[PDB]
Structure 1
């Protein structure tokens, strides 16, 4: 008789994995013992299609950080997680002064210390994050670009003047909370090709669902 599970909040709860940073010792990948991750909630595959059910949305995100070595090991290493709000400058190097700009919230924690966890508010200067924008910002490559949907960047790095002694891997989970949505719309039935637009494969246009032989046979 109850329908608590079919609510928006119920549907979008759960902290999913949306990011993974690699900080190897020897490597082509993030060679300066640091990394910048612009917040992308599409990071959880399944996500995109779920949110793209609505035209507008609003919510808060709870971020939880999981860090270990590639084998999932724990070591005595301290870390800095920096959140650079949109409009704030991300660090270009492992010594950029951005790391010390008070206006960039930062949180420190040892790998041993349990997961780091913080809540981030509804940033957008607009009244709601909008997944679809039918226009351009005052044939073009700026089509469908609602920038005021930026949540910010997360800069991660080993604390200290020198490179870390261990190879590290950070995982970022994100639980969406206090959700409100407007204007529902057709469930994506075609495969996604790009993170930006809704473009699809005009050759590989598949029928929404399983087909059959005749309309008289089951």
Structure 2
């Protein structure tokens, strides 16, 4: 008789893996002991199609940082997770004064301490985030870009002046909370090609679902 599992909050609950920061010792990848992850809810594969069932959405997010080495080993390392809110300058070096700017909330935590966790509010200057924007921000390459959807950035790094003794990995999990949505729309039925637009492979336009031999044979 109950219907709680079909509420928007239920449909969008749970903490999913949205980001993975690699901090290798030797390597081509993130060579400066730091990394800048712009917040992307699309990080969880499955999310894009789900949020896109609606046109406008509003919500908060709880971020959880699970860090360890690539073998899942736990080591005595101090880390810094800095949230640089939209409009703020991200660090460009392991020695950027941004890491020290007070207005960028930072959490300092040990890899041994349990996962760090914080809450990020609805950041948009608009009344709601919107996955679709039929327009251009004051043929073009700016079509469909709603910028007022920036949630901020998380700058990760080991603490200290000298490189860390250990190879690390920080997994970022995000739980959406206090969800509200408007204007439902048809559910994506063609594979995605680009993060920013609805472009679809015009050669490979597949039917929404499975087919059969004849309409009279089950």
Q: Give TM-score, length-normalised by structure 2.
A: 1.00
- Deviations 1:149-181, CA, capped at 9 Å, x for gaps: 000000000000110000000000000000000
- Deviations 1:100-152, CA, capped at 9 Å, x for gaps: 00000000000000000000000000000000000000000000000000000
Which secondary structure does the structure 2 equivalent of 1:166 belong to?
Answer: coil
CA RMSD, aligned part only? 0.3
Q: What is the CA distance between 1:206 and its match in structure 2? A: 0.2
- Deviations 1:80-118, CA, capped at 9 Å, x for gaps: 000000000000000000000000000000000000000
**2: CA distance, partners of 1:119 / 1:8:** 19
**1: CA distance, partners of 2:184 / 2:83:** 32
**2: CA distance, partners of 1:217 / 1:10:** 38
Q: What is the CA distance between 1:41 and its match in structure 2? A: 0.4
Q: What is the CA distance between 1:60 and its match in structure 2? A: 0.2
Structure-to-structure mapping, 1:206-217, within 5 angstroms: 206-217=206-217
Q: What is the CA distance between 1:202 and its match in structure 2? A: 0.1
Aligned length: 218
Please name the residue that 1:130 is paired with: 130
- Deviations 1:53-86, CA, capped at 9 Å, x for gaps: 0000000000000000000000000000000000
- Deviations 1:16-43, CA, capped at 9 Å, x for gaps: 0000000000000000000000000000
Structure-to-structure mapping, 1:1-218, within 5 angstroms: 1-218=1-218
Q: What is the CA distance between 1:185 and its match in structure 2? A: 0.1
**1: CA distance, partners of 2:98 / 2:48:** 31
> Unaligned stretches of 5+ in structure 2?
none
In the TM superposition, structure 1's runs of 4+ consecutive aligned residues that sit over 3 Å from their partners are none
Q: Give TM-score, length-normalised by structure 1.
A: 1.00
